[PDB]
Amino acid sequence: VSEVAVDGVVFPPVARPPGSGRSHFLAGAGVRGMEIGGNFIKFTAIGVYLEEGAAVSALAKKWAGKSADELAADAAFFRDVVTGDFEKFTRVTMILPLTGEQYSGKVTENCVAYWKAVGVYTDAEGAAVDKFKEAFKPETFPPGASILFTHSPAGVLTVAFSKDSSVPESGGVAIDNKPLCEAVLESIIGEHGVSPAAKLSVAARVSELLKEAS
Predict the structure, then answer these.
(1) CATH code of the domain occupying 4-53+83-188
(2) Which of 12, 47, 92, 159 has its CA 20 to 30 A from that of 5?
(3) What does the alpha-carbon distance between residue 45 and residue 117 come to, in Å, rounded to a whole number?
């Protein structure tokens, strides 16, 4: 696949998550923002990488022969990407500066809000959120810094950090909680995913890769 540039952040076409031993291809990338003052403010650039070989083989079974527009409009496609039996890897690269405490507080607060509403919040998720916040607490992310998320096929979220766009080779903190692992990816590409740009990129690029497998 080709590289994708997002507002000064270059995402290479391949990634190797720290210590996973797998290679990924760039499924898609896009900016992520929040409405501030009635306008869209860009905060991060996000690249979504999927396991080479295994993601295409799994996704082709239900989504082969579908166009970019059809995949982009079908929330069940993105749900299949999130829950898929293959590794995923997300790189969040800062456009505006963020501190670990605020980023992790917001992510987890929103996860716990949902889980408890739908009554699936268990001690396990509370512990996973604590471990997630503990990993982010000492960290600050100037522009260009990155958060790296490995989403293992069984549902382990590994959290690592980088001062720039590069990916470390030594793994980060392993958080063995499938709900948190999927929620982090879901918050990006899900129905209410915070990056519509990333979602459109993934659907266009995966649609064309699915054609070379059929």
Answers:
(1) 3.50.70.10
(2) 159
(3) 30
User: Phi, psi (5° rounding) for residue 211?
Assistant: -75, -35
Model resolution, angstroms: 1.7
Q: Number of helices (H) and strands (E), helices first, in the chain?
A: 7, 11
| Closest by CA position to 80, among listed 108, 50, 125 | 50
Distance of CA 194 to the CA centre of its chain: 10
Closest alpha carbon to 24 in 90, 85, 79, 76:
90
Domain range list for the chain: 4-53+83-188
123: Cβ–Cβ under 8 A, 6 or more apart, which residues? Answer: none
Q: 100 and 139 in contact (C-beta within 8 Å)?
A: yes
Q: Which helix (H) or strand (E) holds 31?
A: strand 24-36
- CB-based burial, 90-110: b 16+ in 10 Å, e otherwise: bbbbbbeebebeebbbebbee
| Method underlying the structure | X-ray
Largest CA distance in the chain: 47
